[PDB]
Ligand binder design. Structure first.
Ligand SMILES: Nc1ncnc2c1ncn2[C@@H]1O[C@H](COP(=O)(O)OP(=O)(O)O)[C@@H](O)[C@H]1O
Ligand SMILES: [Mg+2]
Length: 399
């Protein structure tokens, strides 16, 4: 196996992309290092899959071995990483201020905005890990229905962070809160999109009243890339709904300029550049990655395999429905057209107006439709269905 050795000076990162067709393994052999905020263990081997784009950064100096074929691999000497540490430091300062003023203290809340392909998701992950290493437990909030890191696409979601992200797998998806939007773009149904992120904010505000540690943890919030026309108005509305203290704008000067003139004055607005390590993606790449996220939901990861169940469900044992004039519930008659679509298990026990704003237990995928036998085959994370009310998503997946 072909090997590449890299010496990283303090404040440098090894940026690499796995080949189109192979894994790459990483081992820290001396010193200290981290990947998007999680500390590496000395002499532990970390294995990454094809087309991964990764950076391993060190604060003190490290020597790192890479095993396998790479499409690119270089050490960058200039990064925005101190910018992110300082965003973390400022958040923890706000916690301690509010803790002594409450002797319960409420943690700070941060909104990340900008167009697609600027490193927005990655920055969210760094900030979450730094909070955990400090002894704190933050809440991560995901509003990108096109590229979601907590649940399936076409969702808005949130999760309590109690341990640093796994280097390969990201954050433990241990009991998230999840809502189904059912399209990849907010422009498909603008008024529904806005209604869902409002309900998310309301739900989280009630949860933290029962957990002092999560309350003081605070929130880190990832947005979609729609910044023009009606997308602009969407950004302003999310900032008010989550009562954010801080807005971080990545790489859009007209947007930063326009928002400085509209946001309330107490909101701290910071423009930051995108990392030189972020590459432009195309229409086909995002669509492809949506498929891969769906696969993970059911089957898990290499390190922690999930073992999903495939079983049949009678149409008499469930109710199928679709949202959307724009935000009305419509009951679906099973047809050949639902094949390949995701459906959410609503926490609502009936197919009501309450379906619209209820979170979900999780999802299934409709793999087959037998119109004559009146059954469908589904893929499901647990042995029996957690709910009888199934909600349509326009997201399709060929499994
Ligand atoms: N410093 C970096 N070096 C190398 N790759 C990076 C770096 N930061 C982010 N990436 C990669 O670039 C891609 C795009 O980043 P992402 O955070 O998903 O962008 P956005 O959320 O703005 O669309 C991801 O594969 C991510 O892992
Ligand atoms: Mg993103």
């Amino acid at each position: 196996e072909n090997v590449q050795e890299f010496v990283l000076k303090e404040d440098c990162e090894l940026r690499f992309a796995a080949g189109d067709d192979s894994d790459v393994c990483l081992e820290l052999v001396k010193g200290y290092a981290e990947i998007f905020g999680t500390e590496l263990l000395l002499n532990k081997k970390y294995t990454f899959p094809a087309k991964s784009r990764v950076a391993a950064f060190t604060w003190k100096g490290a020597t790192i071995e890479l095993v396998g074929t790479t499409e690119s691999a270089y050490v960058a000497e200039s990064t925005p990483m101190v910018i992110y540490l300082n965003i973390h430091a400022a958040m923890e300062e706000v916690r301690k201020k509010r803790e002594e003023q409450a002797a319960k203290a409420k943690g700070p809340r941060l909104l990340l905005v900008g167009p697609t392909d600027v490193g927005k998701t990655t920055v969210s992950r760094i900030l979450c890990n730094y909070s955990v290493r400090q002894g704190r437990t933050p809440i991560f909030v995901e509003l990108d229905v096109g590229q979601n890191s907590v649940s399936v696409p076409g969702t808005v979601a949130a999760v309590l962070v109690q341990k640093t992200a796994d280097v390969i797998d990201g954050f433990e998806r241990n009991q998230p809160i999840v809502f189904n939007f059912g399209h990849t773009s907010p422009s498909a149904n603008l008024s529904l999109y806005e209604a869902l992120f409002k309900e998310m904010a309301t739900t989280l505000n009630a949860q933290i009243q029962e957990n002092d540690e999560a309350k003081i943890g605070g929130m880190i919030i990832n947005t979609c890339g729609w910044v023009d026309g009606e997308g602009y108005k969407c950004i302003v509305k999310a900032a008010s709904a989550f009562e954010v203290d801080v807005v971080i704008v990545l790489d859009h000067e007209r947007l930063y300029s326009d928002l400085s003139k509209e946001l309330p004055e107490f909101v701290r607005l910071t423009h930051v550049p995108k990392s030189g390590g972020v590459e432009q993606r195309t229409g086909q790449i995002r669509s492809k990655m949506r498929g891969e996220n769906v696969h993970r939901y059911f089957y898990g990861t290499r390190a922690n395999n999930l073992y999903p169940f495939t079983f049949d469900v009678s149409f008499d044992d469930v109710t199928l429905c679709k949202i959307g004039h724009e935000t009305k519930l419509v009951i679906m008659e099973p047809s050949a057209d639902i094949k390949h679509h995701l459906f959410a298990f609503s926490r609502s026990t009936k197919a009501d107006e309450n379906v619209l704003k209820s979170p979900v237990f999780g999802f299934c995928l409709v793999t087959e439709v037998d119109l004559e036998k009146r059954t469908m085959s589904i893929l499901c994370p647990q042995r029996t269905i957690p709910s009888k009310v199934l909600v349509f998503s326009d997201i399709t997946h060929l499994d």
